[PDB]
C-alpha cells in the first residue's frame, strides 16, 4: 500500500 515504501527490515515495527 501507499503510505511509505520501506526498504530495510530494521525500520519495521510489529503490527498496530
Amino acid at each position, epitope marked *: *500500500p*501507499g503510505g511509505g*515504501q*520501506i*526498504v*530495510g*527490515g*530494521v525500520y*519495521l*515495527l*510489529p503490527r498496530r
Partner: antibody
Amino acid sequence: QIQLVQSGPELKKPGETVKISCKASGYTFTDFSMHWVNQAPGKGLNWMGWVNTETGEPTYADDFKGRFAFSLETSASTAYLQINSLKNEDTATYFCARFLLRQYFDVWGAGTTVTVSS
Amino acid sequence: DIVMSQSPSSLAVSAGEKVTMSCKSSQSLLNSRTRKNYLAWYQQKPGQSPKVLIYWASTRESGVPDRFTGRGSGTDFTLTISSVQAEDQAVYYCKQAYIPPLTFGAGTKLELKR
C-alpha cells in the same frame, strides 16, 4: 498473474548511453518499491538500488552511484534504468524486481542483457 | 554494508539425498521488535531470473516445495533440501534486507550425481 516485461537485448559501444524499461502488470504499480539487480556473465547478483514508486525518489548503491539513473512513468506503470557513458564493464543482464514489505523479491523481470563492444 | 558469506561454493549430491548449505552475515539480521530475521533465499537456474524460496529466514514461500527449508537466527543461517531432484540444479543465493544496501552472498552451485 503479476508481470514485469523488460525491453530487449541492447548492444551499445563504449561511451554511448542506454535506457531500458520494465512494465508492471497485475498490481497497483504505485504501491510497491521497484528494485534493480544486475549480473555480469558468470557472476553473482548485485543490488543496484531502488525507486520509491509512490514518490519517484531513487536510492543507489555505492557501486552504482554516478552514471546510473532510475526513472518512472506512473501512468504507464513502467520503470526505466539508464546507464550513461557505457564502459566495457557494464556488460551485464540487469533485472527489475518487485519488493514486498516482508523484505524479499516475489516478482522479477526476465532481465535485459546489454553488450558494450565495438 | 553487511557481508554475506556462503559455503560451500559448490555441492554435488545424487537424487534423493539431503543437502544443506550455509550463509553467514557480518552482523545480526534480527529485528528484536518484530522478532524476525530478514534473510531470504533465492533459486536461479541457467538462463532464468532468480525466484524466492524462503523469507523471514525460515518462512517457505507460497507454492515452494516442502523439501526446501531455511533455518538460523542472528548471523548463521542455512538452507536445506531434503530430497534433491534433477530440477533443483542451480545456484542458490541468500540475501539480507535488514539494513540497506541489500546484499547477496556469492551463491552455492547444486550439481547432481548419477
